[PDB]
């Protein structure tokens with residue numbers, strides 16, 4: 072079973088594509104080494120096609136079926152409802168790709184008779200026909216990185232009308248089923264504060280902790296027809312309306328399992344027999360399947376008191392050490408089992424005995440201290456990709472503002488606070504756009520957020536301590552500092568100076584602006600203001616699922 076077959080028609084862009092970092096008058100103030108930042112384009116799609124295209128073999132044993140039965144028993148306790156057309160329309164992002172059939176995302180949200188009538192017709196066809204593959208578009212993503220070049224990632228998605236029907240049939244299921252089935256292991260239920268707390272508590276719950284990340288090579292491609300049918304059998308355990316059962320069976324047979332791929336010019340590029348990246352069930356499906364395969368590999372490997380944390384294809388296991396030699400051997404058996412289940416590693420997993428050395432959701436635990444000097448754990452990452460993207464967004468308006476998502480999700484970090492907040496608040500001040508709502512993504516869902524709302528968002532997701540962290544670790548400081556030399560970003564001392572300016576400017580404006588100056592930039596003044604609570608999201612993952620929050 073090959074993950075894809077190809078005709079030889081090219082994956083085509085739908086618009087002009089920039090690969091070189093755009094530069095304006097603000098660029099050099101953030102980043103000098105411009106030639107290190109690039110965006111992927113369709114020109115590299117051929118290279119990605121080669122990576123994602125392979126044969127899958129699967130060998131399924133008793134541990135696999137044992138975990139599956141347990142998951143199904145939990146899933147049987149879920150009661151889910153159909154969403155009305157209206158409800159599903161309201162979940163559609165304002166800038167979601169328009170339909171081939173003469174209406175767009177705004178027509179959908181506005182419940183135009185054209186959009187609604189077509190959606191009813193798509194729904195009825197799902198009920199009537201559980202056989203015919205549904206068309207999908209394949210595109211090369213344009214994403215920004217620092218050199219050391221990756222090929223474009225590919226996205227596969229059905230028409231807007233289908234996307235709305237998906238929401239009707241499955242939004243409630245994908246929202247509620249995974250936490251029921253996986254409990255505390257379900258990663259999307261945690262804000263960053265809750266996630267770091269769960270990781271630390273999980274780590275402290277072991278007599279002698281051992282943990283590891285497992286990186287599956289090209290997870291979407293490893294997903295087989297079996298996996299997707301197993302997923303459907305899980306959804307079908309829920310207490311559902313008969314009409315929902317039928318639409319889910321239909322979406323599975325006609326879309327989820329596979330189908331034809333069409334380029335932006337309407338030419339046939341080939342055929343998919345693996346996970347589509349751009350459907351509603353991508354995140355929930357990947358999470359279930361990763362959790363199933365890994366729970367079964369843990370038993371194969373005889374790992375003791377395994378605690379998993381799963382976000383799609385992102386997987387972390389923390390368990391009881393059996394000793395160093397025993398743990399390394401167990402990890403090999405875990406990997407052999409994952410491989411048989413069709414999920415071979417990209418890089419071999421490594422046992423860790425220090426929590427801060429485990430990377431999960433591209434992040435690691437680290438520690439700083441609050442106002443009182445008490446230890447605070449928080450999640451951070453190498454800032455290289457966030458800063459390359461910030462540089463891009465400095466000179467170019469983009470559909471999604473990663474700088475804003477990074478400020479929200481990495482608010483307690485040295486680099487988000489000193490660089491991202493300082494840089495973008497300065498830019499927003501200059502343009503008097505503090506009040507302008509901007510689109511960003513959190514766990515792949517789309518939010519419209521005004522920068523002026525940041526103080527309360529951060530306090531909720533991270534705690535008040537986020538505004539007073541200091542004495543960061545030498546390792547964390549060292550990683551940030553070396554990233555800045557690599558990219559030609561000004562040293563942290565320059566950012567401190569800039570932040571004092573930005574801060575003073577914000578305070579003057581009173582109201583919300585002054586709240587941003589006071590809370591976001593307290594780290595920048597030598598005699599700190601006493602920071603006190605302020606007056607005036609994490610249920611499930613929907614990456615690729617076209618969800619507006």
Ligand SMILES: CC(C)C[C@@]1(C(=O)O)C[C@H](C(=O)O)[C@H](c2nccs2)N1C(=O)c1ccc(C(C)(C)C)cc1
Nearest residue numbers: 263266432433434450473476477480512513514515
């Ligand atoms: C600008 C980003 C903040 C947006 C992004 C997204 O999924 O839409 C993409 C980000 C990415 O790494 O691709 C990050 C995610 N990491 C792992 C899964 S999702 N993203 C997160 O939303 C995200 C950041 C940080 C975190 C933790 C710090 C690990 C809580 C979870 C999720």
